[PDB]
Ligand binder design. Structure first.
Ligand SMILES: [K+]
Ligand SMILES: [K+]
Ligand SMILES: [K+]
Ligand SMILES: [K+]
Ligand SMILES: [K+]
Lengths: 82, 82, 82, 82
């Protein structure tokens, strides 16, 4: 898959996760963006996490849609840096 | 491995983890499902975690049976979306 | 690498992590075993973590020696189950 | 990629993460080093995490630059041990 397409896909996941967490869980846009990266990278500090059933369901969807996409994106980035 | 078989295997892991956490740790079905995804994806927020020895042993079994299964499932999903 | 050798290697990592956490951080053998799995699987709930400089250094060594070993072990296990 | 070059790259990531967390978040050099390993390995205990917007942005950069680099480093280490 072309590297630029993978870039767009991961950006779309990032927008999806950030907007979702902001609207469902009520955290700031910046915190929501940070939480999205921490989650799709599988870091999961737990300083932020969903506290509502809708947020829990949403988080499971982000996990499924985002972890693979992020993994493919970082490996493609590797190639351009290295 | 056919994609549909991998789907069934990951669903079975999800049922196993959710029912186990619900019965052993006493969290709701929804929280238990969420915890199972967070755990087998290796996100591990720590908002929920086992507090009993049986729960700790069970969690190690879910980690061993579930992380690989989930990893193979997300990569297969990638292919159908992308 | 033969599957049985990978089994021995991951068991050795598990012994190393469990004994180290027990002696350095003073948690029970059971908690230490659980923490070792949570750590080398990269789940990282954070319900247990090192609180001493020696424990922090030890944890970095376990991360480096254990995460790859566990990853290879789970993928080999996949093959026998599936 | 030669193993020694991957070693240098992961060391550079470690220096970047440790110095950044120390200066931005004000934790000790030792805690900052530990946090960097926990983060780039994707363990993410959450005992330490950024509490400032700059720290959150920095952490996302470390996640993107560091997780892939660490992953390639551990797999190369595997080969020399095993
Ligand atoms: K992989
Ligand atoms: K992880
Ligand atoms: K975590
Ligand atoms: K994690
Ligand atoms: K955590």
């Amino acid at each position: 898959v072309p590297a630029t397409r993978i870039l767009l896909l991961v950006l779309a996941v990032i927008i999806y996760g950030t907007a979702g967490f902001h609207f469902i869980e009520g955290e700031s846009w910046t915190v929501s963006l940070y939480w999205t990266f921490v989650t799709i990278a599988t870091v999961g500090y737990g300083d932020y996490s969903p506290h509502t059933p809708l947020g829990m369901y949403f988080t499971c969807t982000l996990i499924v849609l985002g972890i693979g996409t992020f993994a493919v994106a970082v490996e493609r980035l590797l190639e351009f840096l290295i």
